[PDB]
Amino acid sequence: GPHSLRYFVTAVSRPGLGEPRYMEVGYVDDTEFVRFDSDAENPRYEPRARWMEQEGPEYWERETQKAKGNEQSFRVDLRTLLGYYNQSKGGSHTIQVISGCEVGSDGRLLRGYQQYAYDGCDYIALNEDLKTWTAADMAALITKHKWEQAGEAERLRAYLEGTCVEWLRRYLKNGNATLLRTDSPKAHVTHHSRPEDKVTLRCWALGFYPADITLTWQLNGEELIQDMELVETRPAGDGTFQKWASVVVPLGKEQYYTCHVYHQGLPEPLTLRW
């Protein structure tokens, strides 16, 4: 299936409290594997996945230096955006970036992306074509023009089609035991009494990987999508995920409703009842 290498970057100014907080968290699919935190005791790029032990000391030195360099460019960016937006030096502001690439099952590039945001709102983003930029406002229009004269898009495209793709292939390889595994979910339903002869039925799915899963509650063959309560799939602390979906049904009518769990680790979908 497709695989992705994604980096979530954040720069937060802390007026009066010193230098801005700078962080980089990397992901291969749904697995955190590297991280840099400027507030760290000793700021260095560090492994977050066991399989990263295969990288030599030279890897960590290069990435750490890059991060420090990226930290500096973003300190300036924070100052700049204050000018663009005509804001005061005393406020805290944030810059967020999503950078990455995805490959098919055969390892070829499916797509690349890079998006920036200021204070929680879109700023500038590379277009699908990997050649043009799209600004969200006039301030971003200034950055767009600067980037066009500098040749940023050509430079970034080189990274997304080359480095990004090549290193993604390598990570998947060194960590295939982890990244290419499939933990099948384990499901179960719980019952909860409610006022007015009603009950809350909750269907749980635990310990699965990849994160992609489908939980549905049914009645008379039809899936009760509109009548479902549901949480976003969540990391459970050990590299696996969990999720639940609930439906409030009439007391004494519970047995009709069934829970269906769809996941790649289930050749045939799970079907449960309370």
Partner: peptide
Amino acid sequence: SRDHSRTPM
């Protein structure tokens, strides 16, 4: 591997 030497904003 991360991107570097990016044009400032």
